[PDB]
Amino acid sequence: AESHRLYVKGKHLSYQRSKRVNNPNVSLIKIEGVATPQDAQFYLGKRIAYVYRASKEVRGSKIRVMWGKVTRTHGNSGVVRATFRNNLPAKTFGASVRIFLYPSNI
Amino acid sequence: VAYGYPSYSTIRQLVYKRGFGKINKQRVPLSDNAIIEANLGKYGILSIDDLIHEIITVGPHFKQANNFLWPFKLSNPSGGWGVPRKFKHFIQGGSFGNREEFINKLVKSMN
Amino acid sequence: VEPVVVIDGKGHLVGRLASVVAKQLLNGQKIVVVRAEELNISGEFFRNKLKYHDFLRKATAFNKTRGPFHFRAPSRIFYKALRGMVSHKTARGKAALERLKVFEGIPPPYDKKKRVVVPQALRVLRLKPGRKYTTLGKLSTSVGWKYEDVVAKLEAKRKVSSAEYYAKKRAFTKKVASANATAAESDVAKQLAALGY
Amino acid sequence: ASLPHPKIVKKHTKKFKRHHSDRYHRVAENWRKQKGIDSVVRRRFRGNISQPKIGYGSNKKTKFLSPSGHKTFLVANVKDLETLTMHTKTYAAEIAHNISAKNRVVILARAKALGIKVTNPKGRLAL
Amino acid sequence: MAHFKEYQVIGRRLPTESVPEPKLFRMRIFASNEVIAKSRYWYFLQKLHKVKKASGEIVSINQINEAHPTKVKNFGVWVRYDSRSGTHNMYKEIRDVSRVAAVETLYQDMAARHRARFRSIHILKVAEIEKTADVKRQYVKQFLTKDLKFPLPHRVQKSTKTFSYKRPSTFY
Amino acid sequence: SHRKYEAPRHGHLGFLPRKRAASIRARVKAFPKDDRSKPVALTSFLGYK
RNA sequence: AAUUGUUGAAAGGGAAGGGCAUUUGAUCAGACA
RNA sequence: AACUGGCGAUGCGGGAUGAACCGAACGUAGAGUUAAGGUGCCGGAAUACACGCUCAUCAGACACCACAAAAGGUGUUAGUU
RNA sequence: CCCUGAAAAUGGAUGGCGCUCAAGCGUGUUACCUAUACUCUACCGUCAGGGUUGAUAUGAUGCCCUGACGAGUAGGCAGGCGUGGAGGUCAGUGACGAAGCCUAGACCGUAAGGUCGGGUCGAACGGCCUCUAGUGCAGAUCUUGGUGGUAGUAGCAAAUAU
RNA sequence: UUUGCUCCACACAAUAUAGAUGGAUACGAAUAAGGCGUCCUUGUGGCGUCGCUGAACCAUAGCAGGCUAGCAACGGUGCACUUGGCGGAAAGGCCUUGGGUGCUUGCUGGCGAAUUGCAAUGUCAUUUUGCGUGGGGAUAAAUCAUUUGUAUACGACUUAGA
Ligand SMILES: [Mg+2]
Ligand SMILES: [Mg+2]
Ligand SMILES: [Mg+2]
Ligand SMILES: [Mg+2]
Ligand SMILES: [Mg+2]
Ligand SMILES: [Mg+2]
Ligand SMILES: [Mg+2]
Ligand SMILES: [Mg+2]
Ligand SMILES: [Mg+2]
Ligand SMILES: [Mg+2]
Ligand SMILES: [Mg+2]
Ligand SMILES: [Mg+2]
Ligand SMILES: [Mg+2]
Ligand SMILES: [Mg+2]
Ligand SMILES: [Mg+2]
Ligand SMILES: [Mg+2]
Ligand SMILES: [Mg+2]
Ligand SMILES: [Mg+2]
Ligand SMILES: [Mg+2]
Ligand SMILES: [Mg+2]
Ligand SMILES: [Mg+2]
Ligand SMILES: [Mg+2]
Ligand SMILES: [Mg+2]
Ligand SMILES: [Mg+2]
Ligand SMILES: [Mg+2]
Ligand SMILES: [Mg+2]
Ligand SMILES: [Mg+2]
Ligand SMILES: [Mg+2]
Ligand SMILES: [Mg+2]
Ligand SMILES: [Mg+2]
Ligand SMILES: [Mg+2]
Ligand SMILES: [Mg+2]
Ligand SMILES: [Mg+2]
Ligand SMILES: [Mg+2]
Ligand SMILES: [Mg+2]
Ligand SMILES: [Mg+2]
Ligand SMILES: [Mg+2]
Ligand SMILES: [Mg+2]
Ligand SMILES: [Mg+2]
Ligand SMILES: [Mg+2]
Ligand SMILES: [Mg+2]
Ligand SMILES: [Mg+2]
Ligand SMILES: [Mg+2]
Ligand SMILES: [Mg+2]
Ligand SMILES: [Mg+2]
Ligand SMILES: [Mg+2]
Ligand SMILES: [Mg+2]
Ligand SMILES: [Mg+2]
Ligand SMILES: [Mg+2]
Ligand SMILES: [Mg+2]
Ligand SMILES: [Mg+2]
Ligand SMILES: [Mg+2]
Ligand SMILES: [Mg+2]
Ligand SMILES: [Mg+2]
Ligand SMILES: [Mg+2]
Ligand SMILES: [Mg+2]
Ligand SMILES: [Mg+2]
Ligand SMILES: [Mg+2]
Ligand SMILES: [Mg+2]
Ligand SMILES: [Mg+2]
Ligand SMILES: [Mg+2]
Ligand SMILES: [Mg+2]
Ligand SMILES: [Mg+2]
Ligand SMILES: [Mg+2]
Ligand SMILES: [Mg+2]
Ligand SMILES: [Mg+2]
Ligand SMILES: [Mg+2]
Ligand SMILES: [Mg+2]
Ligand SMILES: [Mg+2]
Ligand SMILES: [Mg+2]
Ligand SMILES: [Mg+2]
Ligand SMILES: [Mg+2]
Ligand SMILES: [Mg+2]
Ligand SMILES: [Mg+2]
Ligand SMILES: [Mg+2]
Ligand SMILES: [Mg+2]
Ligand SMILES: [Mg+2]
Ligand SMILES: [Mg+2]
Ligand SMILES: [Mg+2]
Ligand SMILES: [Mg+2]
Ligand SMILES: [Mg+2]
Ligand SMILES: [Mg+2]
Ligand SMILES: [Mg+2]
Ligand SMILES: [Mg+2]
Ligand SMILES: [Mg+2]
Ligand SMILES: [Mg+2]
Ligand SMILES: [Mg+2]
Ligand SMILES: [Mg+2]
Ligand SMILES: [Mg+2]
Ligand SMILES: [Mg+2]
Ligand SMILES: [Mg+2]
Ligand SMILES: [Mg+2]
Ligand SMILES: [Mg+2]
Ligand SMILES: [Mg+2]
Ligand SMILES: [Mg+2]
Ligand SMILES: [Mg+2]
Ligand SMILES: [Mg+2]
Ligand SMILES: [Mg+2]
Ligand SMILES: [Mg+2]
Ligand SMILES: [Mg+2]
Ligand SMILES: [Mg+2]
Ligand SMILES: [Mg+2]
Ligand SMILES: [Mg+2]
Ligand SMILES: [Mg+2]
Ligand SMILES: [Mg+2]
Ligand SMILES: [Mg+2]
Ligand SMILES: [Mg+2]
Ligand SMILES: [Mg+2]
Ligand SMILES: [Mg+2]
Ligand SMILES: [Mg+2]
Ligand SMILES: [Mg+2]
Ligand SMILES: [Mg+2]
Ligand SMILES: [Mg+2]
Ligand SMILES: [Mg+2]
């Protein structure tokens, strides 16, 4: 209607890191309204899209997507680890992100 | 070291899952009963549970039955260690020395 | 959650607000802090006066300008508690900072928007009852902050227009919950009641 | 059409370039190992370039295979191009660089005839 | 040192040809698991008798479960500990519901008030105080006055989201 | 070491920097406090030396 | 070759250059069949 | 001087920083589990839980380690005769 | 536990911000984060243990199974890469363009290095098995030559005057 | 200097983007106390009620939301117009009058949807600039040189010149 959102909103927080070396192969994902890591085993294996724009048209759009998947729960607060076709940019740190509802299980 | 008293349950689950043999070295996975038989059949022992039996009872051939088993190769414990600092005695809230009946839970997390 | 989060500083402990503001900032959440002068600091006013003076003495020797800059206004003190919790010399830090605004008083837009509170930095919830603490306005004014009277003038007039605003509001919601009572016991209402509403 | 092989996995596509080859002109990028006594590089301090070592060496399966699947062999004339006659699923022929234009057309041709791939099939091509 | 269980322990001076059936001594150790408990048993026996683990044996180690775990009790406690300047005995009174739940807060109190860690305390005696008014210490006697009641003012609520739109109460 | 003979500094730092000024008309950085009961008139004036 | 002029593209808040990784721009191989 | 372990000749993780400390010693990678050390924010990780203690008009805050003493206090704390 | 005792020279350091029912001190309970370590797999190389001359196709220092290991200065050894000349050979490349030089184009090698396109050029040159040494450069206040920043700067003001 | 500048209108084009994708939803103050309703003697007042989280409130069905019929209401909301008024802290936005108009899922209907082939953001934001079109509106100056000396190493300053 006014709303069409079929996914949950997310944020690209950090790469996996230690204090002093990061790992672009895993990004860490904050899912809106997901609080425990009990709460976040529901989004395990869901698919994630970071959508973005560009100025060159491509396959007939100026809109692009990087695709990924939740893979495990990260620490006590419902942050989630995830990996992507290509690694998310690092400029994207604190950019939004779509966790979808599929694969499903209800 | 941390050490103590294994149960049949964790001697079972060690041999079955991570037990290999020293067969001209060659660290050989067990995986079939006729691997054992060919080398410990000498002294009885013609089955994997035959191994377990001769181990868990310290029977007449425990030296060659034991040394046949290639030193086990565990992971870091799954739960973690439960101590904060490990290199104290068990009695002093660390991880080493004889913790006895509990050497199991530890092992069944490292397996 | 929201495009911009407006925070009523009044009642909030400096570092514990700075800490949560820093994190909302870095996770992409634009934030605006208001009434910074009504912000709180643990310890009585003297300890925090003394503290600001200790700050105040550090300056580059050969040229006092290139050295540390000391800012007097309750908001710049607040931004300072914040900036040091942000990797502010990086590309990403300048990013996150631009999402943040700090003000004395509640200036336009934000006086008509709703402003929100942070329980985990709320002094009345955080501090132990009986400790002594500091109001950032008094502390600022004692080290050079000029505009403490003007602000409370401008605010004492704000809080008037807003009481009126609230007044009309409370008067209207009396009608609405009035009409809401004629509609009760009807067929609709009792059904919703079943579905939790 | 090339004989079938596992996924070619390269392992380290980046060129190992000599230390400070990038810092003084005098110093070619041509790899040399740092023999000095302080050299972070030789010491493997965290954040310096990495050096060539034998873990990097490629899977014996796919080793020497160009993208296609064909170990390229160098060719100076038809006789040489002919040594590949019973091998085309396995051994492309790269025309030698000094082979004239009138002589690559003999070689290109004969390649097609016999079913052999030619890697650089365009040099001195009268277009 | 952890969450505590009470253990009776029983040992005896390894038998000899000319002294079979040596004499058997019991302690009640306050420890977390049975491996520590026996350690302590030998720690203390070698403080009274000519034994060590090397030459004796534990006869029985048995857990002791509190007799009435929903009967609030007033516990007197007797302690010896080492300070940074010497060693000294004490007596405290703990109000709780099982000998073991008290030994827990004892070691906490000893730690907070007297900076004494486990290694420096000896639990001389723990005892259920039968009649009231044998309750000597005040911080306990407060809780034994008739028809006692008391508010819990300035109540403070664990906020579950970062932002709030109210402005809290501390009401109660 | 340590001076030798203490002696006062040359010049007054509260007149720094010794640059040429913005314009020839130095500015009134301040006006009298206001007595809003008097009549109203100007509180400064201009001329040429 | 160092070094230089022009032209073209690009970056530059107290050096420059490098590692891992990815965005974007440019350029390219192979592989379909 | 003695014994061992090290550094030198050695990178990796912790100790902000650091030849020698803690952990752990290195072929190229993937998944997992951890060590020492940490988890307000910088900074990955509980503004977690529970009992106490401390309010400093120069509080205090983690080994090696980057110092403080005798002597005092009717601050408050719990104990002793 | 806190206070007093407790005095130094640029301005400044529990690492920083900051923190006071702590984000402080003692102690307890869990959860959680992440090393080149541990476990499993893949690939490389090393070492070892075995198997396999039976012709009628291609490697016997070869082929095939299997296990374990991999830090490194001085230093040893090994197996390779590149140059000038020399014996053999591919009846090798070339004025329908050899060598050389250029090239944020291409491919092979872990690497020394190797191969190709295109441009520029003009007379020679290479693979493979052997032979040989005036055989590999970043450094030696190295040798000879060339070139920068410096910098359109220092300066071009004695001797009277045009 | 080749018909330029500017405000409103639409069109094509380019170029962006620290990161829309139902709604940032307005008292103030206290916290060992308050919000709301109600009553009065209008108080530091009587009485009632609530909290214990926004887990809320509002919105939300319709080709991404198409084409149409009607009923019950006289309510709601979008738009462009107009009435009166408020807001200077950064007001640049808020409240109000009155018609016109679109929609209304408040209720009852007629019609459409496939083949995008079992997922591939499946494109619906808002930045800034550029080029022509015609609906309003507007017709400067600063610099060089010359010049004063309240100025000055040079730039700069300060004057003066139809
Ligand atoms: Mg980051
Ligand atoms: Mg991580
Ligand atoms: Mg990737
Ligand atoms: Mg960034
Ligand atoms: Mg960020
Ligand atoms: Mg885990
Ligand atoms: Mg678990
Ligand atoms: Mg653990
Ligand atoms: Mg620790
Ligand atoms: Mg396991
Ligand atoms: Mg953002
Ligand atoms: Mg400075
Ligand atoms: Mg800062
Ligand atoms: Mg940012
Ligand atoms: Mg509180
Ligand atoms: Mg390579
Ligand atoms: Mg060298
Ligand atoms: Mg050295
Ligand atoms: Mg070095
Ligand atoms: Mg030819
Ligand atoms: Mg060429
Ligand atoms: Mg050619
Ligand atoms: Mg003990
Ligand atoms: Mg003893
Ligand atoms: Mg003792
Ligand atoms: Mg909590
Ligand atoms: Mg002097
Ligand atoms: Mg003198
Ligand atoms: Mg002034
Ligand atoms: Mg003024
Ligand atoms: Mg600068
Ligand atoms: Mg085909
Ligand atoms: Mg040592
Ligand atoms: Mg040594
Ligand atoms: Mg030496
Ligand atoms: Mg060594
Ligand atoms: Mg070492
Ligand atoms: Mg380190
Ligand atoms: Mg450490
Ligand atoms: Mg240790
Ligand atoms: Mg920081
Ligand atoms: Mg974090
Ligand atoms: Mg001080
Ligand atoms: Mg003092
Ligand atoms: Mg001092
Ligand atoms: Mg302090
Ligand atoms: Mg110590
Ligand atoms: Mg330190
Ligand atoms: Mg003395
Ligand atoms: Mg003392
Ligand atoms: Mg005292
Ligand atoms: Mg005493
Ligand atoms: Mg204390
Ligand atoms: Mg200094
Ligand atoms: Mg200190
Ligand atoms: Mg810290
Ligand atoms: Mg702290
Ligand atoms: Mg603690
Ligand atoms: Mg648990
Ligand atoms: Mg937890
Ligand atoms: Mg490591
Ligand atoms: Mg590895
Ligand atoms: Mg052989
Ligand atoms: Mg080696
Ligand atoms: Mg080699
Ligand atoms: Mg050679
Ligand atoms: Mg040669
Ligand atoms: Mg030559
Ligand atoms: Mg040449
Ligand atoms: Mg060129
Ligand atoms: Mg090139
Ligand atoms: Mg180049
Ligand atoms: Mg190349
Ligand atoms: Mg090739
Ligand atoms: Mg090629
Ligand atoms: Mg050519
Ligand atoms: Mg040529
Ligand atoms: Mg000639
Ligand atoms: Mg030859
Ligand atoms: Mg030779
Ligand atoms: Mg020579
Ligand atoms: Mg060299
Ligand atoms: Mg060289
Ligand atoms: Mg040189
Ligand atoms: Mg040279
Ligand atoms: Mg050298
Ligand atoms: Mg030289
Ligand atoms: Mg010279
Ligand atoms: Mg020069
Ligand atoms: Mg000149
Ligand atoms: Mg000159
Ligand atoms: Mg001169
Ligand atoms: Mg004269
Ligand atoms: Mg941007
Ligand atoms: Mg308001
Ligand atoms: Mg009111
Ligand atoms: Mg009330
Ligand atoms: Mg009322
Ligand atoms: Mg009345
Ligand atoms: Mg009233
Ligand atoms: Mg009342
Ligand atoms: Mg509400
Ligand atoms: Mg509609
Ligand atoms: Mg319908
Ligand atoms: Mg009608
Ligand atoms: Mg109508
Ligand atoms: Mg204004
Ligand atoms: Mg504003
Ligand atoms: Mg305005
Ligand atoms: Mg209408
Ligand atoms: Mg609708
Ligand atoms: Mg669309
Ligand atoms: Mg026009
Ligand atoms: Mg005129």
Curated annotation (Swiss-Prot), chain A:
Complex and partners: Component of the large ribosomal subunit (LSU). Mature yeast ribosomes consist of a small (40S) and a large (60S) subunit. The 40S small subunit contains 1 molecule of ribosomal RNA (18S rRNA) and 33 different proteins (encoded by 57 genes). The large 60S subunit contains 3 rRNA molecules (25S, 5.8S and 5S rRNA) and 46 different proteins (encoded by 81 genes).
Keywords, sorted A to Z: Acetylation, Cytoplasm, Isopeptide bond, Ribonucleoprotein, Ribosomal protein, Ubl conjugation
Classification via Pfam families: Ribosomal_L35Ae
GO biological process terms on file: cytoplasmic translation; ribosomal large subunit assembly; ribosomal large subunit biogenesis; rRNA processing
Protein name per its UniProtKB record: Large ribosomal subunit protein eL33A
SUPFAM superfamilies attached to this UniProt entry: Translation proteins (SSF50447)
Keyword Cytoplasm: yes
Source species: Saccharomyces cerevisiae (strain ATCC 204508 / S288c)
Position of the Glycyl lysine isopeptide (Lys-Gly) (interchain with G-Cter in ubiquitin) cross-link: K46
InterPro entries referenced in this protein's UniProt entry, alphabetically: Ribosomal_eL33, Ribosomal_eL33_CS, Ribosomal_eL33_sf, Transl_B-barrel_sf
Note: There are 2 genes for eL33 in yeast.
Family as reported in the entry's similarity comment: Belongs to the eukaryotic ribosomal protein eL33 family.
UniProt keyword annotation of Disulfide bond present: no
Stored PANTHER family: 60S RIBOSOMAL PROTEIN L35A
Positions of modified residues (N-acetylalanine): A1
PTM per Swiss-Prot/TrEMBL: N-terminally acetylated by acetyltransferase NatA.
One GO MF term: structural constituent of ribosome
Disulfide-linked positions: none
One GO cellular component, as annotated: cytosol
Subcellular localization, as worded in the UniProt entry: Cytoplasm
UniProtKB/Swiss-Prot annotation, chain C:
Keywords, in A-Z order: Acetylation, Cytoplasm, Isopeptide bond, Ribonucleoprotein, Ribosomal protein, Ubl conjugation
UniProt xrefs under Pfam families: Ribosomal_L13 (PF00572)
MF terms in GO: mRNA binding; RNA binding; structural constituent of ribosome
A cellular-component GO term for this protein: ribosome
Any one GO biological process: maturation of LSU-rRNA
Cross-link (Glycyl lysine isopeptide (Lys-Gly) (interchain with G-Cter in ubiquitin)): K175
Post-translational modification note: N-terminally acetylated by acetyltransferase NatA.
Similarity comment: Belongs to the universal ribosomal protein uL13 family.
Record's subunit section: Component of the large ribosomal subunit (LSU). Mature yeast ribosomes consist of a small (40S) and a large (60S) subunit. The 40S small subunit contains 1 molecule of ribosomal RNA (18S rRNA) and 33 different proteins (encoded by 57 genes). The large 60S subunit contains 3 rRNA molecules (25S, 5.8S and 5S rRNA) and 46 different proteins (encoded by 81 genes).
Function text: Component of the ribosome, a large ribonucleoprotein complex responsible for the synthesis of proteins in the cell. The small ribosomal subunit (SSU) binds messenger RNAs (mRNAs) and translates the encoded message by selecting cognate aminoacyl-transfer RNA (tRNA) molecules. The large subunit (LSU) contains the ribosomal catalytic site termed the peptidyl transferase center (PTC), which catalyzes the formation of peptide bonds, thereby polymerizing the amino acids delivered by tRNAs into a polypeptide chain.
The protein's name in its UniProt record: Large ribosomal subunit protein uL13A
Curated annotation (Swiss-Prot), chain E:
Residues modified as Phosphoserine: S32
UniProt keyword Phosphoprotein present: yes
InterPro entries: Ribosomal_eL20, Ribosomal_eL20_dom, Ribosomal_eL20_eukaryotes
Keywords annotated in UniProt: Cytoplasm, Isopeptide bond, Phosphoprotein, Ribonucleoprotein, Ribosomal protein, Ubl conjugation
Covalent cross-link Glycyl lysine isopeptide (Lys-Gly) (interchain with G-Cter in ubiquitin) as placed by the record, residue numbers: K125, K131, K149
CC annotations in GO: cytosol; cytosolic large ribosomal subunit
GO molecular function: structural constituent of ribosome
UniProt main location, coarse: cytoplasm
Example GO BP: cytoplasmic translation
Signal sequence, renumbered to the chain: none
Function: Component of the ribosome, a large ribonucleoprotein complex responsible for the synthesis of proteins in the cell. The small ribosomal subunit (SSU) binds messenger RNAs (mRNAs) and translates the encoded message by selecting cognate aminoacyl-transfer RNA (tRNA) molecules. The large subunit (LSU) contains the ribosomal catalytic site termed the peptidyl transferase center (PTC), which catalyzes the formation of peptide bonds, thereby polymerizing the amino acids delivered by tRNAs into a polypeptide chain.
Family: Belongs to the eukaryotic ribosomal protein eL20 family.
Other noteworthy facts: Present with 54300 molecules/cell in log phase SD medium. There are 2 genes for eL20 in yeast.
Protein name: Large ribosomal subunit protein eL20A
UniProtKB/Swiss-Prot annotation, chain F:
Residue numbers of Phosphoserine PTMs: S23
The organism's place on the tree of life at top rank: Eukaryota
Phenotype of null mutants: A mutant confers resistance to trichodermin, a trichotecene toxin produced by plant-pathogenic fungi.
Subcellular location: Cytoplasm
Cross-link (Glycyl lysine isopeptide (Lys-Gly) (interchain with G-Cter in ubiquitin)): K38
Described function: Component of the ribosome, a large ribonucleoprotein complex responsible for the synthesis of proteins in the cell. The small ribosomal subunit (SSU) binds messenger RNAs (mRNAs) and translates the encoded message by selecting cognate aminoacyl-transfer RNA (tRNA) molecules. The large subunit (LSU) contains the ribosomal catalytic site termed the peptidyl transferase center (PTC), which catalyzes the formation of peptide bonds, thereby polymerizing the amino acids delivered by tRNAs into a polypeptide chain.
Assembly behavior: Component of the large ribosomal subunit (LSU). Mature yeast ribosomes consist of a small (40S) and a large (60S) subunit. The 40S small subunit contains 1 molecule of ribosomal RNA (18S rRNA) and 33 different proteins (encoded by 57 genes). The large 60S subunit contains 3 rRNA molecules (25S, 5.8S and 5S rRNA) and 46 different proteins (encoded by 81 genes). uL3 forms together with ES39L one of the contact sites for the signal recognition particle that targets ribosomes to the endoplasmic reticulum membrane.
Misc remark: Present with 450 molecules/cell in log phase SD medium.
Protein name per its UniProtKB record: Large ribosomal subunit protein uL3
